[PDB]
Amino acid sequence: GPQSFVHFTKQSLALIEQRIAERKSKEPKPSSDLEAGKQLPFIYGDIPPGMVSEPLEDLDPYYADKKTFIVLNKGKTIFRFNATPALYMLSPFSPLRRISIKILVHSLFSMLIMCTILTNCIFMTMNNPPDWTKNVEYTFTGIYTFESLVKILARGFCVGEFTFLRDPWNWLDFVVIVFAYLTEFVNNVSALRTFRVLRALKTISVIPGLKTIVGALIQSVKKLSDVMILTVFCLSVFALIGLQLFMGNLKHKCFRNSLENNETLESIMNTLESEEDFRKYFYYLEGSKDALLCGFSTDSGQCPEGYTCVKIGRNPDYGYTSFDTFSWAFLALFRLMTQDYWENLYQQTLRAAGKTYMIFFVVVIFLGSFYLINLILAVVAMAYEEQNQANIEEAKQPYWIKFKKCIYFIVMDPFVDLAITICIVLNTLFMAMEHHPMTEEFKNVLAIGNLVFTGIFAAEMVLKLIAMDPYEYFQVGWNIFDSLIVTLSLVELFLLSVLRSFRLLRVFKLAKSWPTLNMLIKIIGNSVGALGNLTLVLAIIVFIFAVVGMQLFGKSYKECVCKINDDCTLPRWHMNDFFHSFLIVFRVLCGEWIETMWDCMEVAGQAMCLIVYMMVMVIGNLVVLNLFLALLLSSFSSDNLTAIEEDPDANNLQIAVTRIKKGINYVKQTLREFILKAFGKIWWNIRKTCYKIVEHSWFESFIVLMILLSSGALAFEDIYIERKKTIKIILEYADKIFTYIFILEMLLKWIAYGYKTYFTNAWCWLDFLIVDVSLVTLVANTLGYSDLGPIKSLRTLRALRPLRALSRFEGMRVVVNALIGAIPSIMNVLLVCLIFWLIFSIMGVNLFAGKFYECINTTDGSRFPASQVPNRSECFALMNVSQNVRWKNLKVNFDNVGLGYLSLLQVATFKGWTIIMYAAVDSVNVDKQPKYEYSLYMYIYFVVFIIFGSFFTLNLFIGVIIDNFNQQKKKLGGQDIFMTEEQKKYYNAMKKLGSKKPQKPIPRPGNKIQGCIFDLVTNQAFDISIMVLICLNMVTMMVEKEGQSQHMTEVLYWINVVFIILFTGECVLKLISLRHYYFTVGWNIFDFVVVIISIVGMFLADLIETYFVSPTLFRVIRLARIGRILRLVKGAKGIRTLLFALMMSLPALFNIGLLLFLVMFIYAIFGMSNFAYVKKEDGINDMFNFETFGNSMICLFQITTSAGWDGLLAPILNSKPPDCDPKKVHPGSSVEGDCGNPSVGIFYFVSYIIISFLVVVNMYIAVILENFSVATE
């Protein structure tokens, strides 16, 4: 008990040695409470003064037999040492060891080490240190040597059981010390310095609670073993498919036909070095670093007249973008899975190979980018949930008085607090009215409004300060926040632009009455509260990655700058200094790494940059994901427990609401009192007949067929409709027929159901609205009103006919029901996000109002320098002197709050954010020419916005969505909400497949030779040998590369033939010892089918390559080789289980995909109707536009993932000259003008991306539920 305390003396050591000797002559787990680095139990009470920081006996009986002692500090933390002398010189009773132990266990020692490490980390941020820092580095080395000297002589060195070298974290300190001394005595700065960066990792061993976080992260990694195996297998299979399909396609270029001086392509290609000379022979678009890609098919890119397509030269993007070898194909597939700049690769591949290959990208995206990320997410979520379960399981186991009191009475909750809430809302609304082209009177009224609001807020603060005591004022955190905001406002009144935006933080005061905003505040508080250690670990990792990158590639970005920049100046993103390196790391964490990959590999080599970037991605994404799930589940369950009632203390808003309910009702009742004081059998059979007709299955089938035909008739109305007069006329008459048929349907439904029943149905209402619009359009066309403006705008509404298919198919119906059930919970979080983004938008408008204007040289699109033309007036003079000059402004900017909202949407999606970032960091003032990175530290605004308005916002949204879907599932009895009844039956039948008990073993045969073959094949040795044979075949397929010699081709062909013969022999042997029991196993059926497919495919490929000319079909049927390596999943149980989970998720995914396809079809028809004639610039070009249904679907599939939607939106925003031409004449059509409608385009793109996000979230949740069900059963 508490009395078990005594100093460790020589007699105790002698007794321990005697006990050890007795145990040896004769020839259990210690208490976790008494483990090293733990608090002393309270059962022992306080420590008497004379033994703190002194050697005493071992309280743990386990070690009571062995030679150990415990020392206790003033914080009741026990430390375990060894009683064996350190290096056989210093005894425990020696004064020197006593001093060393006194130093070791002390708060000041840890504080000194932490301060030293922090100062060294600060000094690591200087890329070009002065000559005075050498002494400071020497001081740091001396301090580290001092601390490593105490420990080494306190616990010994690898000589004891509890000695210095046994601590895994002590190895880092030893390595730091030896590296520093060795590199000092021996003397590249690149390496030695990059190795000194390890002193930053010592923060984990000095800040308490960080080792546990690191161990938890390692444990979370350890549970991801099978998922990474499946990911690598899938990426390799898709890389082989892409290598087969697109080998050398990205090398196609437009080579000129006419060459003088008897010159040939071969002779040209070896005398070309500069792009200026390359441009003379190949076709380059203006401002393009790479040559224009082409293809030999009719759906690929088209060379200009005078140029022919040829495969010659290097690949695009410094030759890093290709499918030439397995390595580059694997890198491209990883890029597709991570969805980093994948739209550029998608567009290049379509241009070089044809639009028909969009199927490959659809399949690869839907599988590698969706399902594998889902698996990683689900497994990491399981790991964290199990860790949390274990943690919670083990944790549970005079005159002044009179007047100041009168003021307190003046403070009344129902009115004063409601008045202050109204004032806060009014102030936010008033400050949201700032814009750039704003007159002086508007500025004056805004200034006086802000002044009066600040005055009333200060008056409130003073009145509350004199009502309650100043000490009574300061316990409430809200009161402290309000006082701080008031002092900041007063400081601004006495006097930057950022300080004026600190008043918007008062909006969070509404969280006392707004429950959902309080959830966001709780998430933000937990980010630095219960989960502060994880956030600190993430910050340390980011800092380490930034400094490591700056050390490795800082000088390379400067010496090799001309390789990545024609001007020979450092690009926008680089690692020359600490700030830009940190910006690169943050951008990588956001998900953009390939474009910086290219520059890094150009300046410093492929291997180093690849290794560094992959490590950064893996570690950073793992930590960010762990933090995300930690916050999500903590605020999901631990924070919300209904401990208190709804506003246990009567909320002031609730009191005001009750007072209003009393007053308004009483006044209305008194007013009412004052007013009173002052003063058919045959018809029924017809209804019976129409009911029978409507509900029959043939009626349903006929109407579904007509709906499908009517929807499909819309795809034909593209810009080429004037070349198809017959089809156009047939379409008009068919539309008339469809209108008649749907009029008849509407009449029959009216007769059968009745007006009440028909008009109480939402689907019937939608059908009625669509048919009414169609009837109005038809009658207007008949009555000659076919060219009116309103009628022409109504005619574009025929894109809503596919909405009639929602009620006809059960999958879309159930998905729509789930979405409508979820909508009410989505709305409140949408409002909270709007308020938060409004605060950020007001801040952005304040910072960047009208500062994005610049004077450019139009013909090349280059901003003029600031030495000349630094003002708007100088730009005006330059325009009226030189024609190709323009003082233009960005289309998406922070001119007002709506444009700020659009800019924030672009930033949050990380699509088009770079232009806004550059314009913000270059901004100077209003009517001032921007200078390169003049406001360099404006990047902090965007980083803070990204963090707060993306990480926490998405966290809150997903947290509420999980609650909504859990309640939806619970309400209907726990059944799946995305599956129909028949789908449920098939799901149960599939579930019985994956839980079958071991079947009856296949009996041996009576024949001797057949029996020997039987005992041969059924051996596990046969299975493992077949697995290694399949692995060798996969390696053989990987060896293939673009440009290989004919000898290699023949060798690989013969190796593949040998493998095919071996697999055929395997199949034949199996067919004899198994007899007809071979077909009783599905895996054997798959093996049979793949052997047949391999033999047939190789025969057909040989026949085509020998006696035909069709490379495309040759590759398509040579893709059958992939079947052989798909058999590897038989041997691996984990990836087989994951594939079973995917097969489980398939039906719900099919329903959600049907809904998404219908939405995409509607949006494609609308885009064809609207943006078919928009100018071809930015993301719109000859191959990716809205001219054709195929083109529209190509564009919409790209932006279903949010990829490149800014580039598509930008051309539409042109509305007035010189941006567009309102009277542009298009040959072959009567449509005039190439301008776009900004409002229609903005609504189109914003609504589509929002709907796509909702549908993708639904798919994510369905897959995760199917994954959780499979693993936990």
């Binding site: 441009r279 200009p304 005078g306 810009i719």
Partner: protein
């Protein structure tokens, strides 16, 4: 953008008519300088005779009786890069019937390269006394009325058969 539509093959005597000739460049972003020449051969003759040439925003007409004062340029305006090279005949006459070829000569200006290219497009135009309705409108309309009449007979017939059946149930009641 630019769509190559074929010219209508039918012209009505005494009215106006436009002969379409659209030749779009393979890439829209390129720059070129285009001029066109039109050649016409009447029925009963086997030789093609040049009738007009358009270049640099000025139209030049050959001295031919059949086309003097009844041809105006309907085509691209304001540019030396022309993708609609069409012509309009102000009063059609029987002599106009015959086969017309539009030859477009385009010089495409490229970096270090100029390619000169030619396209010949052939139109056959027949002057007719009165306009003649397309077979497709005539066939489609007859089919829309036959489908609308066929569907109405199936609904009326099915209803008559069902009502007879339901009537029996009420009596059986």
């Amino acid at each position: 953008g630019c769509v190559e539509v074929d010219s209508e093959t039918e012209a009505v005597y005494g009215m106006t008519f436009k002969i379409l000739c659209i030749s779009c460049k393979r890439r829209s972003e390129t720059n070129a300088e285009t001029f066109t020449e039109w050649t016409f051969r009447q029925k009963g003759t086997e030789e093609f005779v040049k009738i007009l040439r358009y270049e640099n925003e000025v139209l030049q007409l050959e001295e031919d009786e059949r086309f003097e004062g009844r041809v105006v340029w309907n085509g691209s305006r304001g540019t030396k890069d022309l993708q609609d090279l069409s012509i309009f005949i102000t009063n059609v006459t029987y002599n106009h019937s015959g086969d017309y070829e539009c030859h477009v000569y385009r010089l495409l200006f490229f970096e270090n390269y100029e390619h000169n290219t030619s396209v010949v497009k052939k139109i056959h135009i027949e002057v007719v006394d009165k306009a003649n309705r397309d077979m497709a409108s005539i066939v489609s309309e007859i089919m829309m009325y036959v489908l609308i009449v066929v569907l109405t007979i199936w609904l009326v017939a099915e209803m008559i058969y069902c009502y007879k059946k339901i009537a029996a149930a009420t009596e059986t009641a």
